[PDB]
Enzyme design. Sequence first.
Site, PDB file in Angstrom:
ATOM      1  N   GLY A  32       0.846  -1.171   0.000  1.00 48.41           N
ATOM      2  CA  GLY A  32       0.000   0.000   0.000  1.00 48.41           C
ATOM      3  C   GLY A  32       0.882   1.221   0.000  1.00 48.41           C
ATOM      4  N   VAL A  37       2.564  -5.559   3.023  1.00 46.04           N
ATOM      5  CA  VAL A  37       1.861  -6.523   3.855  1.00 46.04           C
ATOM      6  C   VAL A  37       2.483  -7.885   3.599  1.00 46.04           C
ATOM      7  CG1 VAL A  37      -0.331  -7.664   4.342  1.00 46.04           C
ATOM      8  CG2 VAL A  37      -0.265  -5.206   3.850  1.00 46.04           C
ATOM      9  N   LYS A  52       2.022  -5.822   8.598  1.00 43.95           N
ATOM     10  CA  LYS A  52       2.370  -4.598   7.890  1.00 43.95           C
ATOM     11  C   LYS A  52       3.770  -4.161   8.301  1.00 43.95           C
ATOM     12  CE  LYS A  52      -1.240  -1.395   7.499  1.00 43.95           C
ATOM     13  NZ  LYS A  52      -1.180  -0.097   8.291  1.00 43.95           N
ATOM     14  N   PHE A  99      -5.215 -12.205   9.801  1.00 43.98           N
ATOM     15  CA  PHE A  99      -5.104 -12.472   8.371  1.00 43.98           C
ATOM     16  C   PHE A  99      -6.488 -12.816   7.830  1.00 43.98           C
ATOM     17  CE2 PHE A  99      -4.259 -15.822   4.975  1.00 43.98           C
ATOM     18  CZ  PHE A  99      -4.040 -14.913   3.955  1.00 43.98           C
ATOM     19  N   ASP A 142      -8.933   7.020   4.616  1.00 45.04           N
ATOM     20  CA  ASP A 142      -8.455   6.242   3.472  1.00 45.04           C
ATOM     21  C   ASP A 142      -9.453   5.144   3.122  1.00 45.04           C
ATOM     22  OD1 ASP A 142      -6.700   6.042   1.377  1.00 45.04           O
ATOM     23  OD2 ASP A 142      -5.218   4.809   2.457  1.00 45.04           O
TER      24      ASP A 142
HETATM   25  C1  LIG Z   1      -2.675  -1.946   1.730  1.00 44.40           C
HETATM   26  C2  LIG Z   1      -3.274  -3.298   2.067  1.00 44.40           C
HETATM   27  C3  LIG Z   1      -2.849  -4.283   0.995  1.00 44.40           C
HETATM   28  N1  LIG Z   1      -3.589  -5.508   1.110  1.00 44.40           N
HETATM   29  C4  LIG Z   1      -2.873  -6.732   0.966  1.00 44.40           C
HETATM   30  O1  LIG Z   1      -1.680  -6.742   0.747  1.00 44.40           O
HETATM   31  C5  LIG Z   1      -3.595  -8.046   1.083  1.00 44.40           C
HETATM   32  N2  LIG Z   1      -4.128  -8.464   2.425  1.00 44.40           N
HETATM   33  C6  LIG Z   1      -4.742  -9.625   2.542  1.00 44.40           C
HETATM   34  N3  LIG Z   1      -5.252 -10.013   3.820  1.00 44.40           N
HETATM   35  C7  LIG Z   1      -5.012  -9.273   5.044  1.00 44.40           C
HETATM   36  C8  LIG Z   1      -4.427  -7.986   5.251  1.00 44.40           C
HETATM   37  C9  LIG Z   1      -4.446  -7.722   6.612  1.00 44.40           C
HETATM   38  C10 LIG Z   1      -3.878  -6.371   7.424  1.00 44.40           C
HETATM   39  C11 LIG Z   1      -4.074  -5.223   6.758  1.00 44.40           C
HETATM   40  C12 LIG Z   1      -2.539  -6.316   7.407  1.00 44.40           C
HETATM   41  N4  LIG Z   1      -5.040  -8.815   7.242  1.00 44.40           N
HETATM   42  N5  LIG Z   1      -5.376  -9.761   6.272  1.00 44.40           N
HETATM   43  C13 LIG Z   1      -4.891 -10.481   1.362  1.00 44.40           C
HETATM   44  C14 LIG Z   1      -5.533 -11.676   1.454  1.00 44.40           C
HETATM   45  C15 LIG Z   1      -5.664 -12.536   0.229  1.00 44.40           C
HETATM   46 CL1  LIG Z   1      -6.476 -14.052   0.390  1.00 44.40          CL
HETATM   47  C16 LIG Z   1      -5.191 -12.155  -0.953  1.00 44.40           C
HETATM   48  C17 LIG Z   1      -4.490 -10.830  -1.054  1.00 44.40           C
HETATM   49  C18 LIG Z   1      -4.365 -10.057   0.068  1.00 44.40           C
HETATM   50  N6  LIG Z   1      -3.713  -8.831  -0.035  1.00 44.40           N
HETATM   51  C19 LIG Z   1      -5.007  -5.515   1.375  1.00 44.40           C
HETATM   52  C20 LIG Z   1      -5.285  -4.486   2.473  1.00 44.40           C
HETATM   53  N7  LIG Z   1      -4.701  -3.207   2.130  1.00 44.40           N
END
Ligand SMILES: C[C@@H]1CN(C(=O)c2nc(Nc3cc(C4CC4)[nH]n3)c3cc(Cl)ccc3n2)CCN1
Length: 293
Positions: A32, A37, A52, A99, A142
């Site tokens: 992001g 992440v 993060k 997650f 955001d």
């Molecule tokens: C800027 C961020 C970028 N994102 C990802 O990289 C992100 N986060 C996920 N799952 C998360 C994220 C979290 C907290 C927020 C750590 N918990 N579970 C994801 C789960 C699947 Cl299956 C496929 C792709 C994903 N991408 C989405 C959120 N916005």
Amino acid sequence: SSHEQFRAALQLVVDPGDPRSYLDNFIKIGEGSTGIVCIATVRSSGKLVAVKKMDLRKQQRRELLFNEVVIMRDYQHENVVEMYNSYLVGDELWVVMEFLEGGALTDIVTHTRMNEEQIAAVCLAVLQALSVLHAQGVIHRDIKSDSILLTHDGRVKLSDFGFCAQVSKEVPRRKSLVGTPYWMAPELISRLPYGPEVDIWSLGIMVIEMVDGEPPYFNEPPLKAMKMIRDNLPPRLKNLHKVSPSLKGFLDRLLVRDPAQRATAAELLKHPFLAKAGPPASIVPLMRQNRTR
Ligand SMILES: C[C@@H]1CN(C(=O)c2nc(Nc3cc(C4CC4)[nH]n3)c3cc(Cl)ccc3n2)CCN1
């Protein structure tokens, strides 16, 4: 120096130590505006967590990462991604979180049409979060589809509080230009005093994402999109004539230029459109199959 002062300050509100004492097998899965992440595994356990990672030295607004760790500490709400712990590792802030295995709403919007039962379900989940956050003086700042995460059984949770702000009786408004250009409220782009209403404008833009597949002006350079949001009439649905009167009447209460006439989260929760809101099971198909708009 200023960076060393801020890092000492941040060290005081995060958990002590190194989470590499119990987290294994980091893999980047996304990114992001403030960082990346990863997924990680709790050592000696099968538990998966999201981490993060934000380099302090790269941040344009480092004080707002303070806000995220502090304000969202032990925040327990059905529609908010749970934060477990936070750490300072060298020059990086690490935030260990729940997650969500259904992915981000961005991926749903780009790969499939949603029906209005599904759109209403997502809006209901976000507004339940915002109604509580806004009553406590927290502006997210955001709101967009990438900030919205799903479970495999179709629950919907808000995350990405790295730009959030606290307002109070003494200081009820902010003026900072913060957010993602295509979702920014016009009064915020104008750096006029603004309250939690800016999250409601951003939700309107996300509704356009859900109906049209992208936000307005999405391929315009971000400074030009911001000028058009600030100066022109609210953006409209490209698929205007494919939605119900209820959805358009709903959207019309979000994309109101004058923040004092824009609906609040609590008012929107009463809107007839959200009587359509489907249960978690109505969201499940969206993660398993695609349907072109
Ligand atoms: C800027 C961020 C970028 N994102 C990802 O990289 C992100 N986060 C996920 N799952 C998360 C994220 C979290 C907290 C927020 C750590 N918990 N579970 C994801 C789960 C699947 Cl299956 C496929 C792709 C994903 N991408 C989405 C959120 N916005």
